Amino acid sequence: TCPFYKKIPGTGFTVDAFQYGVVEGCTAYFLTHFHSDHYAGLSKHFTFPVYCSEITGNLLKNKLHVQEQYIHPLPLDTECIVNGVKVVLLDANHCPGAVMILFYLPNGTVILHTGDFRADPSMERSLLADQKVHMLYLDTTYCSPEYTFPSQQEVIRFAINTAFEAVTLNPHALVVCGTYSIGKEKVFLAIADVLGSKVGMSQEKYKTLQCLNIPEINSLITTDMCSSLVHLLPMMQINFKGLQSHLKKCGGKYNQILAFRPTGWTHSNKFTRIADVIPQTKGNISIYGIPYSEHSSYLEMKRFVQWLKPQKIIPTVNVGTWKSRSTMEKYFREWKLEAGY
Ligand code: NI
Numbered sequence: 001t002c003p004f005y006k007k008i009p010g011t012g013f014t015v016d017a018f019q020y021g022v023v024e025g026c027t028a029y030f031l032t033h034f035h036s037d038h039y040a041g042l043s044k045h046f047t048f049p050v051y052c053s054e055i056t057g058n059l060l061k062n063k064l065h066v067q068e069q070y071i072h073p074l075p076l077d078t079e080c081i082v083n084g085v086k087v088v089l090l091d092a093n094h095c096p097g098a099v100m101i102l103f104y105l106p107n108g109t110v111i112l113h114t115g116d117f118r119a120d121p122s123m124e125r126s127l128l129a130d131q132k133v134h135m136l137y138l139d140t141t142y143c144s145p146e147y148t149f150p151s152q153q154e155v156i157r158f159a160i161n162t163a164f165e166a167v168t169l170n171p172h173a174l175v176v177c178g179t180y181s182i183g184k185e186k187v188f189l190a191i192a193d194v195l196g197s198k199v200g201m202s203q204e205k206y207k208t209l210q211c212l213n214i215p216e217i218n219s220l221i222t223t224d225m226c227s228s229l230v231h232l233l234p235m236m237q238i239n240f241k242g243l244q245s246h247l248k249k250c251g252g253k254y255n256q257i258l259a260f261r262p263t264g265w266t267h268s269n270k271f272t273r274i275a276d277v278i279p280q281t282k283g284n285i286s287i288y289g290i291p292y293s294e295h296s297s298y299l300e301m302k303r304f305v306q307w308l309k310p311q312k313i314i315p316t317v318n319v320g321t322w323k324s325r326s327t328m329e330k331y332f333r334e335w336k337l338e339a340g341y
Contacts, residue, residue: 005137005314008113010105011085015113015137018042027083028072032115033098034059034182046070051082053089055097058211059182077127090126092117094294095183096212102127112308113137114316119296119304128308136310140317141295143328147265148298149291150274156190158274159260159290163191166258166286167229173256175230176246178238182208183294184262189220191260192230200228226253235261240282247285256284262292302335309341 002020007013012027018041023029031052032038042050044065049072052060057073060066074080076089076099086104094116103111112133167173175195177188192199199221201209206223214220222228233246238261247257269291279286296304305313313332318324 005316005319008103008111010107010109011103012083013085013103015101016115018046022048030101030113031056031060032092032101032113033095034063035095035116036181038116039064042066051087053097053099055211055213056099058213059097059208062211063208088127090123090128093120093123094118095181096185096214097182109134111135111137112310114139116141116294117296118294119300121303123304124307133308134311135314136305136308136312137314137316138301138305139295140301140315140328142265142293142298143301143315143318143331145298146270149265149269149293152186152292154274155290155292156186158277159187159288160190160194162288163258164194166256167195170256172254173258174247174250174254176233176238176243176257176259177230178235178259178261179205179232180235182212184292185209185212185214187260187262187290187292188230188232192220192228195229197229198222198224198227199230199232200225201232205232225250229254238287240285240287243285243287257286259285259287261287261289263289264293264295265291302331305332306335306339309339 002014002017002023006015006017008015012025013030014023014026015030016032016038017023017029018039028049028051031050034056042064044067046066047070050060050070051072051074054073057071060071061068074089076091080087088102090100090102092098092100092115098115100115100117101113105111110131110133114137116139163175175191188199201221203223206221209217209221225231238259243257243259247254266289277288279288315328318328
């Protein structure tokens with residue numbers, strides 16, 4: 001059965017609610033983004049209307065086989081009527097195709113559902129500027145002050161400089177980057193660009209990237225591993241064993257691997273600056289964990305919420321323990337007392 005924080009009151013609508021069977025009274029199922037915890041339950045046998053971005057629609061059709069007649073893509077930054085209710089989709093600054101959803105309810109209430117997002121000051125100049133929000137359904141993944149990490153631009157700067165130095169010292173080094181879902185593609189695209197290479201990958205991953213409307217993609221990626229000196233591998237293989245095994249398959253073209261594991265936050269963020277990050281090394285294999293986040297830091301979340309001044313906040317992450325819920329409610333009250341709303 002569908003929990004309350006996935007229902008939109010006064011509508012026939014649900015958000016990211018595909019794992020509960022037929023939800024009673026649901027006339028339209030919204031999907032914020034193509035991450036498996038959120039799409040859990042969708043397949044080619046789904047027969048209700050799905051509302052989403054163009055990019056999420058390409059992934060539902062090609063990767064999960066959902067039939068076309070049930071896919072309803074909406075443009076961004078555009079007022080749309082769905083089953084008699086005005087809605088707007090906004091870029092969430094998460095993975096490709098990820099949206100926030102503004103709902104203008106028949107009684108005058110306005111609801112923002114962030115999906116998953118990385119709050120940014122540029123959101124203060126979207127269609128959010130114009131009007132009041134009564135309820136905020138908020139991605140609270142990192143809602144605690146210990147959760148700090150750098151900007152995505154600093155992280156990318158570190159990765160490009162590290163890869164360019166290693167391969168210039170040793171032209172026979174291979175670079176490998178881990179992946180397990182969509183998102184974070186800037187990591188491997190920026191590294192391949194500085195190295196003058198396409199990115200090599202499996203047919204399955206190529207198919208997924210082909211759904212993403214990335215400009216000039218055909219010039220950036222390939223399934224011909226032999227032509228490429230940046231390879232993608234599943235995240236599970238980014239360890240000394242998996243990487244040894246990969247280097248054997250490359251036919252003595254390379255004598256060294258430099259690898260990247262994009263994570264979210266890890267406790268080594270509480271001590272070490274991005275500049276000071278060092279790898280794990282065994283022999284001719286080095287593995288860097290880099291903190292590339294597609295979710296708000298605590299500070300970015302607090303700034304967003306203090307700017308929007310919602311009347312009520314409903315968290316959508318970390319909702320399963322009393323201690324988590326109590327912690328998040330304390331911070332919401334500090335934020336409100338500090339800013340005066
Ligand atoms: Ni996500």
